[PDB]
């Protein structure tokens, strides 16, 4: 599939 | 086996230009810590084939941001090293056969991945003097 998308959302984060 | 020939490559085949199969792909990768090198000089070359056209490597591109930016996160820093590694030279080449629309995304995700600081700063400065000289002027 191919919902929206921007780089500079996604996880960096999450969880250790 | 959780490994075969191509894998990386046959997942790339199936991912498209979205967070959807990307993320989910990177999932996978992040799962693979124990052989992030492996996985590492698989995609590189897979990349580095050009019996893949812009847009396969266009998918390999959001996957490696997703990846290293978990890598980064937790803690699998064999990730973000492995793939960091590879990216000066690897992401220095996607600029040779990227379209200017493209390279200038391109430029945005490693841009992204700069300001979030993956990459160790010494290896950031390998992928910035590699995507200038990629420029194709100077």
Do not use: C
């Amino acid at each position: 599939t191919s919902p929206s998308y921007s780089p500079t959302s996604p996880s960096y984060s999450p969880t250790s | 086996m959780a490994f075969s020939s191509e894998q990386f490559t046959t997942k790339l085949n199936t991912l498209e230009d979205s967070q959807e199969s990307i993320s989910s792909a990177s999932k996978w990768l992040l799962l693979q810590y124990r052989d992030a090198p492996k996985v590492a000089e698989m995609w590189k070359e897979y990349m580095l084939r050009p019996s893949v056209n812009t847009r396969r490597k266009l998918l390999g591109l959001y996957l490696m941001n997703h990846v290293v930016q978990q890598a980064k996160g937790q803690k699998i820093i064999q990730f973000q090293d492995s793939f960091g590694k590879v990216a000066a030279e690897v992401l220095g080449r996607i600029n040779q056969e990227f379209p200017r629309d493209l390279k200038k995304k391109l430029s945005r995700v490693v841009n992204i991945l700069k300001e979030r600081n993956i990459f160790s700063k010494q290896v950031v400065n390998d992928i910035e003097r590699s995507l200038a000289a990629a420029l194709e002027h100077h």
